RNA sequence: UGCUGUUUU
């Protein structure tokens, strides 16, 4: 059962690091508010209101233990273990031309998922395909999923590898895979 | 990053 706990804690790490990451934090009004009141410190009481974390755990001890063993070294834990924050060692990148051009060059468009596909289905599908930093499910005005996504890879190398892999499928369907540069 | 809408159409 120590095995299941370790796997649970990896997920908790990944989820919280996403929330405070480069691809969510700057567009996350609710998280931004909480981050201004203390020196970046946000209480665990408030973090467990985030739905994906909430399904993983509501136990403070499990979250604190997860982030202590994390290899990303993004999150710090307060002295009293009640609050977490993004390390002042990891500032948010200034959104420059260089930065956005660098993100664009490793961002990929994929179309051909079923419209009833969930984020968890897509994540499962992307597991062996390279380090992915963001998944954006493209939606209509009324919030129906189109069956296309934008994915941001860690490096152009890992994006290129993926884009150049021949006949990629989601179960049944052939996928259209394009650099976001090539999509309009 | 992105996406979205924006009548001094």
Residue A103 placed within a domain? yes
If one counts the domains in chain A, the total is 2
- Report the nearest residue to nucleotide B4, CA vs C1': A141
Return the CATH number at A73: 1.10.10.10
Q: Strand B: which nucleotides have any atom within 7 A of a protein Cβ?
A: 1-3, 5
Residue after which a domain boundary falls, among A53, A85, A117: A85
Q: CA of A41 vs C1' of B2, distance in Å? A: 26
Resolution (A): 2.3
The technique by which this structure was obtained is X-ray
Instruction: Report CA Rg, chain A.
Output: 18
Residue A36 placed within a domain? yes
Q: Are residues A15 and A44 in the same domain?
A: yes
Residue after which a domain boundary falls, among A57, A85, A113: A85
Q: Are residues A1 and A81 in the same domain?
A: yes
Q: CA of A167 vs C1' of B6, distance in Å? A: 41
DSSP 3-state assignment of A134? strand
Residue after which a domain boundary falls, among A85, A114, A131: A85
Q: CA of A152 vs C1' of B7, distance in Å? A: 36
Q: Retrieve residue A156's tokens.
A: 């152009």
Give the Å distances, CA to CA, from A92 to A13, A18, A21, A89, A109: 18, 13, 8, 10, 25
Residue A64 placed within a domain? yes
First to last CA, chain A: 48
The DSSP result for A146-182, as a single string, is EEEEEEEESSHHHHHHHHH-SS-EETTEEPEEEEGGG
Strand B proximal to A104 Cβ, under 7 A: yes
Strand B proximal to A99 Cβ, under 7 A: yes
**Domain hosting residue A138, numbered range:** 95-184
Residue A18 placed within a domain? yes
DSSP 3-state assignment of A2? helix
Q: Are residues A134 and A173 in the same domain?
A: yes
Q: Are residues A39 and A13 in the same domain?
A: yes
Residue A90 placed within a domain? no
Q: Are residues A111 and A172 in the same domain?
A: yes
Query: How far is A54 from A181, CA to CA, in rounded Å?
Result: 36
């Amino acid at each position: 059962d120590n095995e299941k706990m370790a796997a649970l804690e990896a997920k908790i790490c990944h989820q919280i690091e996403y929330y405070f990451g480069d691809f969510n934090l700057p567009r996350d009004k609710f998280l931004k508010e909480q981050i201004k009141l203390d020196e970046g410190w946000v209480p665990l009481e408030i973090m467990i209101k985030f739905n994906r974390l909430n399904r993983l755990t509501t136990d403070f001890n499990v979250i604190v233990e997860a982030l202590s063993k994390s290899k990303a070294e993004l999150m710090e834990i307060s002295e009293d273990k009640t609050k977490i924050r993004r390390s002042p060692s990891k500032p948010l990148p200034e959104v420059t031309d260089e930065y956005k051009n660098d993100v664009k060059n490793r961002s990929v468009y994929i179309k051909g998922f079923p419209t009833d596909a969930t984020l968890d289905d897509i994540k499962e599908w992307l597991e062996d395909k390279g380090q992915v930093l963001n998944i954006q499910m493209r939606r209509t005005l009324h919030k129906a999923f189109k069956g296309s996504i934008f994915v941001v890879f860690d490096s152009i190398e890992s994006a290129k590898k993926f884009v150049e892999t021949p006949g990629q499928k989601y179960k049944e369907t052939d996928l259209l895979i394009l650099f976001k540069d090539d999509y309009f």
